Every structure is written in structure tokens, then in C-alpha cells.
């Protein structure tokens, strides 16, 4: 109890952080997670795992929520904030043991927590774009391997980089913003690995109309169908009379025929082109293309929902018109500026051109083999996700670890200004920062004592900027962990993450401290 | 809850003994470990996958070793022993040193470059095959069967493996990837002989269809696979109220008739006799077809129908309207109820696509057949592995001693701390040669140093020690061969496997 529990508190803070600072980030090492005593799972990034892991200390109890609290918020700081949750504890652990009362400087670390946000003001870059987070190439290239993406590791990036940043794309049913909604996009492995292209609007993942379908219908009024047209058995269809053994078979056949005119009515009513996430039977598809209607079926739900949110407003994904599209009541009108069905990647995809009412884009990545589709997969993800915090946060923190040394000395500057005890509250605070360079040096098999100290030598007075890194701070690496530049290597954050993880770790240390008595009734 | 170096130890620790005792069990020349149950149940096996089991397992990475083992047991099932050797080799050598040299990391990386050099050398060390010449394939199967020392029936099953699996091979992503196995259909049969079996076209339907009213033989009626929805509609298109009374029996059962026929006439539109009815099966459905004198085979699996989807090479049809040959029963095709033994077997042959056969197996009975089938199962897969990979390598130390030089040549040239894995990589090749030197029962250090020289000039391209020839030898003349991938497949695993436990410093519950 007392220290012994607050140590045990501090200990558990250190104890669990042991798992993550090895598991930390994509420098981390994957770790075996037993589910009960018997069922083991393996990742790095404790943020995932500690949620899945049973947290056996009240600290461990008080924490995983907070990382999840951070993790509910944003994936950044999650596996982190538990770090300085542990840091300042061990830091302040002896301070209280020294002369400090746990209340004394703990307000100061908040006052210290503000200096950083006082510094967050002066340190951000509101330009989130032209240099890019993990630069431009470095963003996607890092989440690329080098396979068939590698030669384009720089090239595919600034494509997908400048893609989701801003390109012509329908946001959710065309939201007037940067591509908040990601971007529809394709990795279609084939032809050259260099022929990967952004294309106008949406090259479908679809079953093209096989009935002799028109392979271009200009300015397509669209029915995007999440509804399959198919057929059902009508024991008696249109007419009655049997003048022929033909006429015996026409009745139950006429159910199929009323679609033709209704399609021809639909030719007149709700769509130039039918887009169906479901199947359009060639039987059904017959009723279309003979009217001269492009009718596309089994379209990718991703595509179509993005083509639905491309087309705009009315769509046949809404109401189900039956018997191969019962004639539209014109809640079904979609919008495509034009629709050309263009062979791309040695295959015809119908290429939706933007939208008649909206911009849209699929990018088609052309590799050889899925190994592009496997890599530009996550290359997109990062860049996409990068772009998305780039999208939302224009203000973004320049530098990964070069802030640490600044933020160290930045307060270590303001440290002495207090005098007395909370001069310490500004120090261990600024001390507890450098584990970020540590753990990144650690998990990169590097040593921040060379790296993080090299950090603190970079300054005129203080700032983290890609002005002059010889005389100032900017950026960071993972594989190394030394300051680098923003368009170069040197890392980033968006604007927001800190204050959360800041206040989180700020609050993380304090509260379990307050209790000295675990004991029982 | 487990930690770091101790994990790293327990990695090297467990993965050591994990990699080990079955190497005595390795080789056509082998040493079978005994396995005692706590009750006293005794076991004699060369199979690690088997050996993995009775042994009481605690170390969760050993469980994870069982994983990539089962994962490889899924892939080949052979070399699951051999895959965990090298990870045991890998994890043993570089790890502790290079983690006491402080990293999984350079260890992690260099196995990327451990991998490729051999992957390169593989395409150099493995030579292409005639999958066209099944004899060029047969010797492999002749080789594939005999490490566990089964020849007698397999010598035929060797050929029969070649036959179907090249046919049961039709598969394309457009890059034409062929994994296709489920096309190959095998038959438990009583009577005949292990030396009499065959591969019959389409997919022979053995397991769950003995059904005697399939008729027997279908000359060219169609077989009908129904994702219809043949279920009688008690109303016009729908199912009306049930029959609790006389009035519901007359009106409803009448409309139940039409929907069967109008679909079964759509079935008749493709003109079958045999209709194997899966979705929409109705007591009126077969009865109508039986009234149609269309044998309607019900109480049946769609797995059979998936076998039948590969028996006519067709699909199964949800379309009620206008049922087609190309819809179901693709191609002219056959269906025949055959008695091999006296068991009724539907044979649906002549898939619309060629490369259509499925393996008939006769033993003197099911069991001595199962002797064939189990070994044919190995025989048949090596095919689609040779059919997978049309390159193949002189085995043993030839396979082993080749890359280490280039690898050391790399390490020498690469001269980083990555060189140290390429040193740690170098001789890990030679452990099965040690086992081969176990297999011959000879002096390893010599034969190594001897085979080391055999790669100094010959470059051990075909030259390993083969414990079964006992000696450092050309493995081409000697004829030690496997399709390249299998080598890599064994080789690819252990890299990642080691690299896997190379990541773990933490077990946590």
C-alpha cells in the first residue's frame, strides 16, 4: 500500500507498457496473446491486444479504457498514451518519494500538459497537402512493399496521394468536400505494372451485358440495382387463347414479355443504363439491349454504392422493380455524365464517367499479379487514411520525434521559470517524452540515447520545422528514429491526437496515485 | 504472460526439440520414435504431424509450431516435419546470438534474402519437367511414395495419380492457376484389386449415391442439378395453406403438380432421365418426375451435385425457367449406376470440358484399396504439385548445399550484420543431410565437409549426400526429385515460421 500500491500502480504502468513498447507501432514486434490460458493470438500494436487482453491491475483496469478511449477517438496515441501513462508515474514515483506531495507537481504536469498545447498552437502545419504525411511517396510507398508497386512506389503514391486529397470524386452521394468518403478505385492486376491509371468516374466491377448490350450509352441515366431482376413462375401470364401449340406456351411466356415493353418503357423512363449489383438474367438482359439499353449486372457493391452515391438522388437500388424491372416509376433515375464500356486491364469494364450530376473517379491500378492488389491494397489504406486525417486536419503536427526534444526543452525552458517544485513538474513531463524516440529506436533496433540526444541538439531557440534541421528540429524516422524532414522522411501528426493522449497520460498517472488503500471490508 | 529473452529462449528452446526427433524419423531410411500414452498406449511413426499430437503440448509457440505444421499439413502434409526442421534450424542459430547481438531485426530481414537467393537458386537448382510425359512425372511419384516405404499397389497408383490429376487439373484465374483437387473423385470399392483401378470421366458419383432408381445407365439423358426451387408451389407460384382437411388436399395438391412439371418440363426442356434434386426437393417433385419416368434422385447432397457440377463440368441452376444442358448436365455426358464390388455407383462422365476423369479405386476390398487411396492421395497431389510446378530439383544435400554458398557468398559480399543470418542460414540446409547422414548412418562432419567440397567445384547442383544411397552423389542420376515449389514450400514455411516466432517476445493471457 501507499507507495507499495502506488508503486504497484506505477509498476503495472511499467509492467504492461513492457508488452507494447516492444509491440509498438509498425516498428513493434508481434506478441502472442493467449485468450484464456489456451488460445493464443499474435500481433504487435498493443492497442488492439490490451482490449482483447484481460487487464489484471486496477491501473491495467484504469488504462485499457483510456487507450480505448484514445482508440475510440483515433488510432494514434492508443498504444502510445499508455507509455507516458507509465512514464510520469515512475518519473513522479520518486518525486513523491522525494519531498513531493502527489498533488504538488501533478497540477504542474497539467500546466506542463498545457505548455505543449501552448506549443501545439505555435507548432502545427495547416498545410497538410503538398508535402504529405509520411510525405507523398513515403506515405503510400511505406505501406507499399516493393514488388510491382515498388518502381511506382513513388509513382503510385502521388497518384493515390493526390487522388484522395482532391480528385474528381463523388463523396457520399456527392458531399462537397475533399474525398472524405475515400475514392472508388481498382487494383486490376494485368497488362503493365506501369499502366495503373486513375480513370474518369467508375470503371465497373460488374458483369457487362452479354446479350449484345450496347457498350456505350452516352450520358447514362442510371438504375443502380442492389435488386436482382431474375424471374418467377407465373402459372398464367398475359393473354389466354390457344390458337397454336405455340399459343399454349405463350401465356406463361408473356410474363417475360411484359418486361420488354416495360424495359422499353424503362428505356423511356428511368435509365439509359441499368446497373445491377444483382444478376440480370440474359433473359432479362435481352429485354434491355434489344431496346438499345446498356444493362449492366452483378456490379460491385462497393462500385455500385459508390456509383449510387455517384449518380445521385433517384436510383433503383431503392425500390425493387420486378419481372426484370417492372416499368420504372422514375424514382430510379441515376446520373452518369457519359458511360463508355472500355476494355481496361485486358478486360472491358463499363467506365462510369464521373456522374451526370456529380464528379466521380475510380483509379485502376494495373499490375501483373494480385501482388499489386495485395500491396497497393494497404498502400491505398495508409495514404487514404493518411489523406483522411490530411483531409479532416489541415493543421497537422510536423515532425515525429523532433517535437519530443523540442517539447522536452520547450518546457525544460519553461521549467526553471516556475522555480521550486513545479519546475520539476515541467521537467519529468519533458523527460517522459523521450520514450517515444526510445521505443521507436528500441523497436527499430536503434538507440535513442544516440537518437533522442541528437534530437535535443537541434535548435536555434526552439521549433520543429522543415526550415533548417541542421539548426532546428523537424521530423523523425522509424527504421532510424532521427529527425528528418516533412517532404523527406520526418514524421507527422495531425493536429488533434496529442491533447487527448496528452491529457490522457496526464490523467493516467494521477488517479491511481490518489488511492493508497486497496483493502477490503 | 511470458517475456522476451525467455520467449526467445523458449523459442530456441522448444523449437529445438520441436524440430528434432522426427528427423530420426525422416528419410526413406528413418528412425521411428516410440510414443507412449500415459495409459500405456504405444505409437510408432515417422509422422511429425502424428508425433505432434500424443505428446503433451504446453509451450504456446509449440502450439504455433503445430499451427504452421498443420498449416503445412493442410498444404502438403509431407515436409511438415521438414518445414519445422529449418525454422528450428533458423531460430536456433541466429536468434540467441543476434538477439544477444540485439535484434530479431537483421535476422528478420536477411531471411527475405535467405528466401530469394534460394528462390533464385531454386529456379537454377530445380529443372523443369514434362507434365506432358507422365513417366517423367512417374519417377517423381515412384520417388514420392517410397520415403514411407509404400510401393506395392502405389506403383500402379503412381500412374493413376498422373492420369486424373492432370485432367482433374483444369483451372484458370486467367493466369491459369490450378489447385483443383475436388474435381478428382476417389472411390472406396470392395473387390477388384489394388492393381486394378482407373479414372473415369466427369466426376463419378460414389459416396452418397447408390440410388438404384437413377435408372442405371444414362446414354444421353441429362443429369439435372437443381438450385431450383423445384419445391411444389401449393398455389400458382406460391405455397398455399397446409392440408388439415379434404378440401385443402384436392385444390392445393393440384397446383403443387403444375409448378413441379412446369419446372420439370423446363427440366424436360433439357431432356433428362436422371434429375438429382437438391434445392426445391418435393415428395411430389420426384413423384412427378417418376411419373414423368424421369428418375429424380433426392435425399442427396449438393456436394454430390458439386461433384456433379464437376461431373458434367456444369453449374447448378436456380433458374426455374428454361432449364438447359449448359445450365445443368453440360455436354452430352453420361450417367451410369455401376456396381464395382456390388456397390451401386453413379458414373457421370464426359464433362463438357475435357480433362475430365475421376479416380476409380479398386483394392481387393475397401481397406487394401484404402492402402492405394491413402498413398495415391499422396501420389495424386504430388502431380498437381508437379502440375503446380513444372520445375524439379536433385534432392538431398544437392538441394541443401547449393544455396548456402551463394548465401555465404552473399554474406561474404553483403558483409553486414545480415551476413550473420546468411551464415546462420548457410548450414541449416545441411541438417536433413545430417539426417540423410543419419539415414545412411554415417559420419556427418565428414560428409558435410565432404559435401561442402562437393559444392566447391561441382557446386552440389545435383550433389548431395543421399543417406539412402549413403553417399555424396549426383541426385539426378540417382534421381532424387521433387517439384521445385515443394522444396520452396518446405523452404518458404520455415523462413516465415522462424520469422514468426522471431517476432514474439511476449506470450500473454
PDB file of C-alpha atoms in Angstrom, chain A residues 258-487:
ATOM      1  CA  UNK A 258     -44.145  -7.513 -70.424  1.00  0.00           C
ATOM      2  CA  UNK A 259     -40.612  -6.735 -69.270  1.00  0.00           C
ATOM      3  CA  UNK A 260     -39.538  -5.894 -72.833  1.00  0.00           C
ATOM      4  CA  UNK A 261     -42.059  -3.082 -73.185  1.00  0.00           C
ATOM      5  CA  UNK A 262     -41.553  -2.088 -69.550  1.00  0.00           C
ATOM      6  CA  UNK A 263     -37.821  -2.040 -70.276  1.00  0.00           C
ATOM      7  CA  UNK A 264     -38.681  -0.109 -73.414  1.00  0.00           C
ATOM      8  CA  UNK A 265     -40.825   1.924 -71.036  1.00  0.00           C
ATOM      9  CA  UNK A 266     -37.769   1.988 -68.759  1.00  0.00           C
ATOM     10  CA  UNK A 267     -35.776   2.872 -71.845  1.00  0.00           C
ATOM     11  CA  UNK A 268     -38.173   5.819 -71.819  1.00  0.00           C
ATOM     12  CA  UNK A 269     -38.433   6.205 -68.064  1.00  0.00           C
ATOM     13  CA  UNK A 270     -35.667   5.859 -65.510  1.00  0.00           C
ATOM     14  CA  UNK A 271     -32.343   4.865 -67.027  1.00  0.00           C
ATOM     15  CA  UNK A 272     -30.088   4.981 -70.043  1.00  0.00           C
ATOM     16  CA  UNK A 273     -28.027   2.266 -68.400  1.00  0.00           C
ATOM     17  CA  UNK A 274     -29.125  -0.385 -65.916  1.00  0.00           C
ATOM     18  CA  UNK A 275     -26.527  -1.112 -63.235  1.00  0.00           C
ATOM     19  CA  UNK A 276     -27.418  -4.139 -61.142  1.00  0.00           C
ATOM     20  CA  UNK A 277     -25.486  -5.385 -58.134  1.00  0.00           C
ATOM     21  CA  UNK A 278     -27.713  -8.423 -58.566  1.00  0.00           C
ATOM     22  CA  UNK A 279     -27.937 -10.681 -61.553  1.00  0.00           C
ATOM     23  CA  UNK A 280     -29.722  -9.600 -64.682  1.00  0.00           C
ATOM     24  CA  UNK A 281     -30.595 -12.801 -66.479  1.00  0.00           C
ATOM     25  CA  UNK A 282     -29.664 -12.674 -70.151  1.00  0.00           C
ATOM     26  CA  UNK A 283     -33.373 -13.373 -70.419  1.00  0.00           C
ATOM     27  CA  UNK A 284     -33.915 -10.114 -68.527  1.00  0.00           C
ATOM     28  CA  UNK A 285     -30.838  -8.563 -70.169  1.00  0.00           C
ATOM     29  CA  UNK A 286     -32.442  -9.414 -73.502  1.00  0.00           C
ATOM     30  CA  UNK A 287     -35.342  -7.096 -72.686  1.00  0.00           C
ATOM     31  CA  UNK A 288     -32.864  -4.243 -72.348  1.00  0.00           C
ATOM     32  CA  UNK A 289     -30.296  -4.398 -75.110  1.00  0.00           C
ATOM     33  CA  UNK A 290     -32.898  -5.003 -77.812  1.00  0.00           C
ATOM     34  CA  UNK A 291     -34.410  -1.666 -76.830  1.00  0.00           C
ATOM     35  CA  UNK A 292     -30.837  -0.443 -77.228  1.00  0.00           C
ATOM     36  CA  UNK A 293     -30.246  -0.188 -73.475  1.00  0.00           C
ATOM     37  CA  UNK A 294     -26.909  -0.861 -71.857  1.00  0.00           C
ATOM     38  CA  UNK A 295     -27.866  -3.087 -68.934  1.00  0.00           C
ATOM     39  CA  UNK A 296     -25.073  -3.973 -66.576  1.00  0.00           C
ATOM     40  CA  UNK A 297     -25.493  -6.548 -63.866  1.00  0.00           C
ATOM     41  CA  UNK A 298     -23.752  -8.044 -60.843  1.00  0.00           C
ATOM     42  CA  UNK A 299     -21.950  -4.736 -60.365  1.00  0.00           C
ATOM     43  CA  UNK A 300     -19.567  -4.461 -57.427  1.00  0.00           C
ATOM     44  CA  UNK A 301     -21.488  -3.376 -54.362  1.00  0.00           C
ATOM     45  CA  UNK A 302     -18.563  -1.105 -53.480  1.00  0.00           C
ATOM     46  CA  UNK A 303     -18.585   0.290 -57.012  1.00  0.00           C
ATOM     47  CA  UNK A 304     -22.372   0.460 -57.237  1.00  0.00           C
ATOM     48  CA  UNK A 305     -22.844   2.046 -53.817  1.00  0.00           C
ATOM     49  CA  UNK A 306     -20.128   4.461 -54.883  1.00  0.00           C
ATOM     50  CA  UNK A 307     -21.825   4.676 -58.273  1.00  0.00           C
ATOM     51  CA  UNK A 308     -25.119   5.076 -56.450  1.00  0.00           C
ATOM     52  CA  UNK A 309     -23.549   7.849 -54.417  1.00  0.00           C
ATOM     53  CA  UNK A 310     -22.082   8.858 -57.766  1.00  0.00           C
ATOM     54  CA  UNK A 311     -25.321   9.002 -59.762  1.00  0.00           C
ATOM     55  CA  UNK A 312     -27.217  10.941 -57.132  1.00  0.00           C
ATOM     56  CA  UNK A 313     -30.773  11.007 -55.787  1.00  0.00           C
ATOM     57  CA  UNK A 314     -33.137   8.603 -57.546  1.00  0.00           C
ATOM     58  CA  UNK A 315     -31.809   5.081 -58.043  1.00  0.00           C
ATOM     59  CA  UNK A 316     -33.290   1.601 -58.462  1.00  0.00           C
ATOM     60  CA  UNK A 317     -31.238   0.363 -55.528  1.00  0.00           C
ATOM     61  CA  UNK A 318     -34.184   1.963 -53.677  1.00  0.00           C
ATOM     62  CA  UNK A 319     -37.395   0.298 -54.898  1.00  0.00           C
ATOM     63  CA  UNK A 320     -37.388  -3.172 -56.409  1.00  0.00           C
ATOM     64  CA  UNK A 321     -38.986  -3.265 -59.837  1.00  0.00           C
ATOM     65  CA  UNK A 322     -39.673  -6.870 -60.618  1.00  0.00           C
ATOM     66  CA  UNK A 323     -40.072  -9.300 -63.518  1.00  0.00           C
ATOM     67  CA  UNK A 324     -36.802  -7.971 -64.852  1.00  0.00           C
ATOM     68  CA  UNK A 325     -37.564  -4.362 -63.840  1.00  0.00           C
ATOM     69  CA  UNK A 326     -41.264  -3.620 -63.884  1.00  0.00           C
ATOM     70  CA  UNK A 327     -41.506  -0.276 -65.655  1.00  0.00           C
ATOM     71  CA  UNK A 328     -39.886   2.460 -63.583  1.00  0.00           C
ATOM     72  CA  UNK A 329     -41.951   4.998 -61.685  1.00  0.00           C
ATOM     73  CA  UNK A 330     -38.880   7.274 -62.065  1.00  0.00           C
ATOM     74  CA  UNK A 331     -37.656   7.223 -58.506  1.00  0.00           C
ATOM     75  CA  UNK A 332     -34.998   5.198 -60.315  1.00  0.00           C
ATOM     76  CA  UNK A 333     -33.175   7.888 -62.365  1.00  0.00           C
ATOM     77  CA  UNK A 334     -29.420   7.795 -61.923  1.00  0.00           C
ATOM     78  CA  UNK A 335     -26.821  10.106 -63.404  1.00  0.00           C
ATOM     79  CA  UNK A 336     -23.742   9.347 -65.463  1.00  0.00           C
ATOM     80  CA  UNK A 337     -22.170  12.153 -67.472  1.00  0.00           C
ATOM     81  CA  UNK A 338     -21.414   9.552 -70.072  1.00  0.00           C
ATOM     82  CA  UNK A 339     -20.969   5.804 -69.905  1.00  0.00           C
ATOM     83  CA  UNK A 340     -18.403   4.130 -72.125  1.00  0.00           C
ATOM     84  CA  UNK A 341     -17.714   0.451 -71.671  1.00  0.00           C
ATOM     85  CA  UNK A 342     -13.971   0.429 -72.195  1.00  0.00           C
ATOM     86  CA  UNK A 343     -11.637  -2.519 -72.203  1.00  0.00           C
ATOM     87  CA  UNK A 344      -9.163  -1.801 -69.414  1.00  0.00           C
ATOM     88  CA  UNK A 345      -6.637  -4.241 -67.937  1.00  0.00           C
ATOM     89  CA  UNK A 346      -7.318  -6.527 -70.919  1.00  0.00           C
ATOM     90  CA  UNK A 347     -10.959  -6.632 -69.855  1.00  0.00           C
ATOM     91  CA  UNK A 348     -13.996  -4.495 -70.518  1.00  0.00           C
ATOM     92  CA  UNK A 349     -15.170  -2.611 -67.512  1.00  0.00           C
ATOM     93  CA  UNK A 350     -18.005  -0.252 -68.079  1.00  0.00           C
ATOM     94  CA  UNK A 351     -16.412   3.055 -67.184  1.00  0.00           C
ATOM     95  CA  UNK A 352     -18.897   5.351 -65.494  1.00  0.00           C
ATOM     96  CA  UNK A 353     -17.691   8.838 -66.330  1.00  0.00           C
ATOM     97  CA  UNK A 354     -17.956  10.797 -63.099  1.00  0.00           C
ATOM     98  CA  UNK A 355     -21.680  11.358 -62.739  1.00  0.00           C
ATOM     99  CA  UNK A 356     -24.121  13.347 -64.809  1.00  0.00           C
ATOM    100  CA  UNK A 357     -24.887  15.219 -61.580  1.00  0.00           C
ATOM    101  CA  UNK A 358     -21.510  14.755 -59.900  1.00  0.00           C
ATOM    102  CA  UNK A 359     -17.787  14.034 -60.219  1.00  0.00           C
ATOM    103  CA  UNK A 360     -16.566  10.501 -59.588  1.00  0.00           C
ATOM    104  CA  UNK A 361     -13.357   8.555 -60.007  1.00  0.00           C
ATOM    105  CA  UNK A 362     -12.185   5.022 -59.878  1.00  0.00           C
ATOM    106  CA  UNK A 363      -8.458   4.576 -60.118  1.00  0.00           C
ATOM    107  CA  UNK A 364      -7.469   1.346 -61.812  1.00  0.00           C
ATOM    108  CA  UNK A 365      -4.157   0.055 -60.629  1.00  0.00           C
ATOM    109  CA  UNK A 366      -2.691  -2.202 -63.295  1.00  0.00           C
ATOM    110  CA  UNK A 367      -0.069  -4.635 -62.074  1.00  0.00           C
ATOM    111  CA  UNK A 368       0.823  -8.062 -63.313  1.00  0.00           C
ATOM    112  CA  UNK A 369      -0.435 -10.148 -60.433  1.00  0.00           C
ATOM    113  CA  UNK A 370      -2.520  -9.735 -57.290  1.00  0.00           C
ATOM    114  CA  UNK A 371       0.698  -8.783 -55.515  1.00  0.00           C
ATOM    115  CA  UNK A 372      -0.074  -5.246 -56.556  1.00  0.00           C
ATOM    116  CA  UNK A 373      -3.647  -5.786 -55.379  1.00  0.00           C
ATOM    117  CA  UNK A 374      -2.172  -7.126 -52.137  1.00  0.00           C
ATOM    118  CA  UNK A 375       0.178  -4.180 -51.594  1.00  0.00           C
ATOM    119  CA  UNK A 376      -1.412  -1.069 -53.076  1.00  0.00           C
ATOM    120  CA  UNK A 377      -4.219  -2.504 -51.007  1.00  0.00           C
ATOM    121  CA  UNK A 378      -2.596  -1.222 -47.829  1.00  0.00           C
ATOM    122  CA  UNK A 379      -0.644   1.415 -49.721  1.00  0.00           C
ATOM    123  CA  UNK A 380      -4.019   2.924 -50.518  1.00  0.00           C
ATOM    124  CA  UNK A 381      -5.124   2.334 -46.914  1.00  0.00           C
ATOM    125  CA  UNK A 382      -2.327   4.377 -45.348  1.00  0.00           C
ATOM    126  CA  UNK A 383      -2.381   7.093 -47.988  1.00  0.00           C
ATOM    127  CA  UNK A 384      -6.169   7.011 -47.837  1.00  0.00           C
ATOM    128  CA  UNK A 385      -6.137   7.070 -44.032  1.00  0.00           C
ATOM    129  CA  UNK A 386      -3.204   9.484 -44.141  1.00  0.00           C
ATOM    130  CA  UNK A 387      -5.092  11.588 -46.662  1.00  0.00           C
ATOM    131  CA  UNK A 388      -8.200  11.352 -44.487  1.00  0.00           C
ATOM    132  CA  UNK A 389      -6.571  12.897 -41.442  1.00  0.00           C
ATOM    133  CA  UNK A 390      -4.927  15.118 -44.021  1.00  0.00           C
ATOM    134  CA  UNK A 391      -8.486  15.608 -45.284  1.00  0.00           C
ATOM    135  CA  UNK A 392     -10.000  16.486 -41.917  1.00  0.00           C
ATOM    136  CA  UNK A 393      -6.933  18.010 -40.232  1.00  0.00           C
ATOM    137  CA  UNK A 394      -5.370  20.786 -42.248  1.00  0.00           C
ATOM    138  CA  UNK A 395      -3.464  21.703 -39.136  1.00  0.00           C
ATOM    139  CA  UNK A 396      -1.140  18.741 -38.659  1.00  0.00           C
ATOM    140  CA  UNK A 397       1.851  18.340 -36.349  1.00  0.00           C
ATOM    141  CA  UNK A 398       5.121  18.422 -38.314  1.00  0.00           C
ATOM    142  CA  UNK A 399       7.740  16.010 -37.020  1.00  0.00           C
ATOM    143  CA  UNK A 400       7.542  12.731 -35.193  1.00  0.00           C
ATOM    144  CA  UNK A 401      10.336  12.816 -32.643  1.00  0.00           C
ATOM    145  CA  UNK A 402      11.882  16.185 -33.301  1.00  0.00           C
ATOM    146  CA  UNK A 403       8.932  17.551 -31.351  1.00  0.00           C
ATOM    147  CA  UNK A 404       9.935  15.306 -28.436  1.00  0.00           C
ATOM    148  CA  UNK A 405      13.243  17.117 -27.947  1.00  0.00           C
ATOM    149  CA  UNK A 406      11.684  20.498 -28.566  1.00  0.00           C
ATOM    150  CA  UNK A 407       8.683  19.641 -26.373  1.00  0.00           C
ATOM    151  CA  UNK A 408      11.262  18.430 -23.890  1.00  0.00           C
ATOM    152  CA  UNK A 409      13.366  21.580 -23.935  1.00  0.00           C
ATOM    153  CA  UNK A 410      10.388  23.783 -24.814  1.00  0.00           C
ATOM    154  CA  UNK A 411       9.070  23.057 -21.347  1.00  0.00           C
ATOM    155  CA  UNK A 412      12.544  22.470 -19.929  1.00  0.00           C
ATOM    156  CA  UNK A 413      12.912  26.085 -20.960  1.00  0.00           C
ATOM    157  CA  UNK A 414       9.727  26.955 -19.072  1.00  0.00           C
ATOM    158  CA  UNK A 415      10.726  24.507 -16.337  1.00  0.00           C
ATOM    159  CA  UNK A 416      13.098  26.831 -14.486  1.00  0.00           C
ATOM    160  CA  UNK A 417      10.647  29.722 -14.854  1.00  0.00           C
ATOM    161  CA  UNK A 418       8.459  28.223 -12.129  1.00  0.00           C
ATOM    162  CA  UNK A 419      11.169  27.714  -9.554  1.00  0.00           C
ATOM    163  CA  UNK A 420      10.559  25.437  -6.598  1.00  0.00           C
ATOM    164  CA  UNK A 421       8.729  22.156  -7.091  1.00  0.00           C
ATOM    165  CA  UNK A 422       6.744  22.545 -10.289  1.00  0.00           C
ATOM    166  CA  UNK A 423       9.969  23.438 -12.051  1.00  0.00           C
ATOM    167  CA  UNK A 424      10.169  19.667 -11.674  1.00  0.00           C
ATOM    168  CA  UNK A 425       6.583  19.251 -12.890  1.00  0.00           C
ATOM    169  CA  UNK A 426       7.823  20.793 -16.142  1.00  0.00           C
ATOM    170  CA  UNK A 427      10.864  18.513 -16.264  1.00  0.00           C
ATOM    171  CA  UNK A 428       9.871  14.861 -15.788  1.00  0.00           C
ATOM    172  CA  UNK A 429       6.986  15.819 -18.023  1.00  0.00           C
ATOM    173  CA  UNK A 430       9.544  16.901 -20.612  1.00  0.00           C
ATOM    174  CA  UNK A 431      11.544  13.838 -19.583  1.00  0.00           C
ATOM    175  CA  UNK A 432       8.699  11.365 -20.133  1.00  0.00           C
ATOM    176  CA  UNK A 433       8.502  12.490 -23.774  1.00  0.00           C
ATOM    177  CA  UNK A 434      11.713  10.905 -25.000  1.00  0.00           C
ATOM    178  CA  UNK A 435      10.495   7.324 -24.603  1.00  0.00           C
ATOM    179  CA  UNK A 436       8.749   7.935 -27.924  1.00  0.00           C
ATOM    180  CA  UNK A 437      12.208   8.308 -29.521  1.00  0.00           C
ATOM    181  CA  UNK A 438      13.331   5.486 -27.220  1.00  0.00           C
ATOM    182  CA  UNK A 439      10.641   2.963 -28.144  1.00  0.00           C
ATOM    183  CA  UNK A 440      10.990   3.853 -31.815  1.00  0.00           C
ATOM    184  CA  UNK A 441      14.743   3.463 -31.552  1.00  0.00           C
ATOM    185  CA  UNK A 442      14.090   0.352 -29.461  1.00  0.00           C
ATOM    186  CA  UNK A 443      11.609  -1.277 -31.844  1.00  0.00           C
ATOM    187  CA  UNK A 444      13.808  -0.319 -34.792  1.00  0.00           C
ATOM    188  CA  UNK A 445      16.782  -1.944 -33.037  1.00  0.00           C
ATOM    189  CA  UNK A 446      18.158   1.584 -32.654  1.00  0.00           C
ATOM    190  CA  UNK A 447      19.281   3.568 -29.635  1.00  0.00           C
ATOM    191  CA  UNK A 448      17.657   6.897 -28.955  1.00  0.00           C
ATOM    192  CA  UNK A 449      20.402   7.787 -26.489  1.00  0.00           C
ATOM    193  CA  UNK A 450      22.207   8.477 -29.728  1.00  0.00           C
ATOM    194  CA  UNK A 451      18.982   9.462 -31.487  1.00  0.00           C
ATOM    195  CA  UNK A 452      16.989  11.356 -28.851  1.00  0.00           C
ATOM    196  CA  UNK A 453      20.072  13.163 -27.646  1.00  0.00           C
ATOM    197  CA  UNK A 454      20.911  14.034 -31.236  1.00  0.00           C
ATOM    198  CA  UNK A 455      17.352  15.368 -31.234  1.00  0.00           C
ATOM    199  CA  UNK A 456      17.836  17.825 -28.369  1.00  0.00           C
ATOM    200  CA  UNK A 457      20.880  19.359 -30.040  1.00  0.00           C
ATOM    201  CA  UNK A 458      18.708  20.759 -32.846  1.00  0.00           C
ATOM    202  CA  UNK A 459      17.505  24.281 -32.190  1.00  0.00           C
ATOM    203  CA  UNK A 460      18.135  27.998 -32.515  1.00  0.00           C
ATOM    204  CA  UNK A 461      15.947  28.540 -29.594  1.00  0.00           C
ATOM    205  CA  UNK A 462      13.178  26.018 -30.269  1.00  0.00           C
ATOM    206  CA  UNK A 463      10.873  24.755 -33.048  1.00  0.00           C
ATOM    207  CA  UNK A 464      10.150  21.639 -35.126  1.00  0.00           C
ATOM    208  CA  UNK A 465      10.151  22.793 -38.707  1.00  0.00           C
ATOM    209  CA  UNK A 466      11.473  21.712 -42.078  1.00  0.00           C
ATOM    210  CA  UNK A 467      13.280  25.035 -42.339  1.00  0.00           C
ATOM    211  CA  UNK A 468      16.792  24.021 -41.299  1.00  0.00           C
ATOM    212  CA  UNK A 469      17.122  20.701 -39.487  1.00  0.00           C
ATOM    213  CA  UNK A 470      20.842  21.261 -39.004  1.00  0.00           C
ATOM    214  CA  UNK A 471      19.915  24.201 -36.787  1.00  0.00           C
ATOM    215  CA  UNK A 472      16.364  23.129 -35.791  1.00  0.00           C
ATOM    216  CA  UNK A 473      14.082  20.182 -35.248  1.00  0.00           C
ATOM    217  CA  UNK A 474      11.920  18.502 -37.809  1.00  0.00           C
ATOM    218  CA  UNK A 475      10.581  15.016 -38.326  1.00  0.00           C
ATOM    219  CA  UNK A 476      11.804  11.573 -37.440  1.00  0.00           C
ATOM    220  CA  UNK A 477      12.205   8.057 -38.803  1.00  0.00           C
ATOM    221  CA  UNK A 478      11.012   4.665 -37.689  1.00  0.00           C
ATOM    222  CA  UNK A 479      13.782   2.429 -39.084  1.00  0.00           C
ATOM    223  CA  UNK A 480      16.154   5.000 -37.625  1.00  0.00           C
ATOM    224  CA  UNK A 481      14.386   7.426 -35.337  1.00  0.00           C
ATOM    225  CA  UNK A 482      16.426  10.546 -36.072  1.00  0.00           C
ATOM    226  CA  UNK A 483      14.986  13.885 -37.223  1.00  0.00           C
ATOM    227  CA  UNK A 484      14.165  14.013 -40.915  1.00  0.00           C
ATOM    228  CA  UNK A 485      12.130  16.335 -42.980  1.00  0.00           C
ATOM    229  CA  UNK A 486       8.453  16.526 -43.717  1.00  0.00           C
ATOM    230  CA  UNK A 487       8.608  16.038 -47.502  1.00  0.00           C
TER     231      UNK A 487
END
